[PDB]
């Protein structure tokens, strides 16, 4: 599976996940921030559209932007260090933000979902603590998407 192939797939898995999530004040345009170095975010940085027609606007922002929490609805988190990671999740505390990381190491440190972009399919894990404190509602059937992503 090539990088273009995986990036495209990451896009559709992210749409999949978004469809199980609700924000307390649903915006007309869903804002996505890509934070830190990423390999697979070029597809989602094109912008996306959800099944109901709501647009997902994407852009990159710096790790140390203190207003990440009010600047977006969704965070796609790349490869950052301990300090940077702390920085980011302290910015998000108390705000209704969905967090997904590109690598599956981050479910232990604050990300709600962590992708494993490797093998034949994009799979992901989730973290209940981070989900519970996130300020958004995640429907538990989101794990249907994950389960089906093996085989």
Author numbering: 39 to 189
Question: What text does the study give?
Answer:
The crystal structure of YfiR was determined to 2.40 Å resolution and reveals two molecules in an asymmetric unit, with each molecule traced in continuous electron density from Arg38 at the N-terminus to Thr189 at the C-terminus. Each YfiR monomer consists of a twisted, seven-stranded β-sheet flanked on one side by the N- and C-terminal helices (α1 and α4 respectively), and on the other by the helices α2 and α3. The mixed, seven-stranded β-sheet has a β2-β3-β1-β4-β5-β6-β7 topology. Analytical ultracentrifugation analysis confirms that YfiR forms a dimer in solution, which is consistent with a recent YfiR crystal structure. The two-fold symmetrical dimer is formed by several key interactions, including salt-bridges by Asp80 and Arg98 and main chain hydrogen bonding between Thr76 of each monomer. YfiR crystallizes as a dimer and features two pairs of conserved cysteine residues; Cys71-Cys110 are in a reduced state while Cys145-Cys152 form a disulfide bond. Two highly conserved pairs of cysteine residues were identified in the structure, Cys71-Cys110 and Cys145-Cys152, with only the latter pair confirmed to form a disulfide bond from the electron density. Mapping the conservation scores for each amino acid onto the YfiR structure reveals a large, continuous, highly conserved region on the surface of the protein formed by the C-terminal helices α3, α4 and the α3-α4 loop, with contributions from strand β7, the N-terminal helix α1 and the α1-β1 loop. The structure of P. aeruginosa YfiR was determined by single-wavelength anomalous dispersion from a Se-Met derivative protein using the AutoSol module in PHENIX with 2.25 Å data collected at the peak wavelength.
The tripartite signalling system YfiBNR in P. aeruginosa modulates intracellular c-di-GMP levels in response to signals received in the periplasm and is a key regulator of the SCV phenotype. The effector protein YfiN (also known as TpbB or PA1120) is an integral inner membrane protein that functions as a diguanylate cyclase, consisting of a periplasmic PAS domain, a cytoplasmic HAMP domain and a catalytic GGDEF domain. The third component of the YfiBNR signalling system, YfiR, has a key role in the signal transduction process by bridging YfiN in the inner membrane and YfiB in the outer membrane. YfiB can release the repression of YfiN by sequestering YfiR at the outer membrane, which requires both membrane anchoring and peptidoglycan binding by YfiB for full activity.
